Amino acid sequence: MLENIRDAVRKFLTGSTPYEKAVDEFIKDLQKSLISSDVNVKLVFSLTAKIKERLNKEKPPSVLERKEWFISIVYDELSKLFGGDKEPNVNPTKLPFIIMLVGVQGSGKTTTAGKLAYFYKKRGYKVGLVAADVYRPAAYDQLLQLGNQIGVQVYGEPNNQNPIEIAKKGVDIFVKNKMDIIIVDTAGRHGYGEETKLLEEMKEMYDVLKPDDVILVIDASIGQKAYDLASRFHQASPIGSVIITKMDGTAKGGGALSAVVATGATIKFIGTGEKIDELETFNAKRFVSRILGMGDIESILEKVKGLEEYDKIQKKMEDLTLRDVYAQIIALRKMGPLSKVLQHIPGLGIMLPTPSEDQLKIGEEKIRRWLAALNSMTYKELENPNIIDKSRMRRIAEGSGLEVEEVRELLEWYNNMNRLLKMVK
Incomplete structure (x- = not known):
C-alpha cells in the first residue's frame, strides 16, 4: 500500500483540479487502498474522518502550501494508524x-x-x-x-x-x-x-x-x-x-x-x-516516512520542532545564551532558505524597544550572516561568547567566509539581544 499511497500523493500535489475535489479524490483513493490492504473498515473510516476534522481545525502555518499541509496531516495520521511515533527499546540492559x-x-x-x-x-x-x-x-x-x-x-x-x-x-x-x-x-x-x-x-x-x-x-x-x-x-x-x-x-x-x-x-x-x-526496527512514523519524499514531511518535524525550541527558549531566557540562534536559524532554514520565510520570520527577538514601528538591526540577506558564526564556533564558544577573542575571531571568521569585523558585528548584536532579554526583568 505505502508504495501505492506514494503515487496518490504525487497526483494531489501536482495541482490538477481544484482543492476540494482533489482532497476528495485523494481521500477516495486512500480509503480504497487501505481497505484493499485488509485494514478494518472501522479504522479506515475514523482515519479519513480524523483527517478532515484536522483539515477544518488546523489551517496551514504561514508559508505552508495548502496542498502541502493536507498531505502533512495525512502521514501524521497514517503514522498513528500504525502505532504512531514510538521507538522501541531493542538493546536490552539486563544481561x-x-x-x-x-x-x-x-x-x-x-x-x-x-x-x-x-x-x-x-x-x-x-x-x-x-x-x-x-x-x-x-x-x-x-x-x-x-x-x-x-x-x-x-x-x-x-x-x-x-x-x-x-x-x-x-x-x-x-x-x-x-x-x-x-x-x-x-x-x-x-x-x-x-x-x-x-x-x-x-x-x-x-x-x-x-x-x-x-x-x-x-x-x-x-x-x-x-x-x-x-x-x-x-x-x-x-x-x-x-x-x-x-x-x-x-x-x-x-x-x-x-x-x-x-x-x-x-x-x-x-x-x-x-x-x-x-x-x-519498527517505528511507524518512519515506516510511513518511507513513502514520498523526506523533504515532503520535512517542514513537519522541522516546523513543530523548530517552533517549539523557538518560542519556548526565548521564554526560558527572560526568566549563558548565544548558541541559541543556531536552533532559531536552523529552524527557519528548514522552512525554505529564501525570503518567503523571512516575511513571516519577524525574527527571534520576538519584539521589544525599537524606533516607532520600523525594526532595529538585521536585513533579509543578514541571513547567511547569522549563520556566519555558528559553524565559526565550538560548543564551548556557543555557551559563553565572552571567551571569543582575537585568535578565535579570526578562525571563526575564515571558517565562515567573512571578515573579523563581521563576527564582531554579529557578536555585538547578540550581546545587544542578550542584554535585552535580560533587561526584560
Missing part, C-alpha cells in the same frame, strides 16, 4: 536476556529466531538459540543450519517432543556457558480463531523459562485478523512484544499492522525479506 519466541504455526517463525539471533549477534552480543519448535520436524535442522550460517550456537534435541523440557535444557545450558542473549523458538498447536487455547498453551512454556521478554511472531498475511490474537496476547502479559513478518509478501501488511497497533501493542520488529539480516 543475560531470555527472549521466548511464540506464535501460530509458520509465521516466519524459525527464520525469525534466525534473523533475530543474527540481529543481536551483529550488535556483538553472545547469543544462543534454543530450538523448541518440535511440531515441525524440519524446524530444528533448519535452525541448526542458520546458526552455523551466522555463527550462533543452537541447542536442540532432535525428535524429542517435549518442548518445555527442551526449552529448559536449552536455556539452562546457555546461561551456563554464560551467554548474553538467549532466544527460544517455540510454536503453537492452534491457528487464528483459537486464541484462548493458543495462549493457554504458551503458559506452561513460559513459567518454565520465566523469560524476560516474549515475542509474538505474526505473518503479515493474516491481515487484520491477527487482531484477536494480538489484543489477548498483549494483555496476558506485561512483557509482551510483537514482530510482524513477511510484510513484503502480502498486500495485507496494513491489516496486520493497523490491527495489532489498534491493540496498543509494541511492534518491536518487522520482517521485511527472506534474507538473514532483513529485520528492521
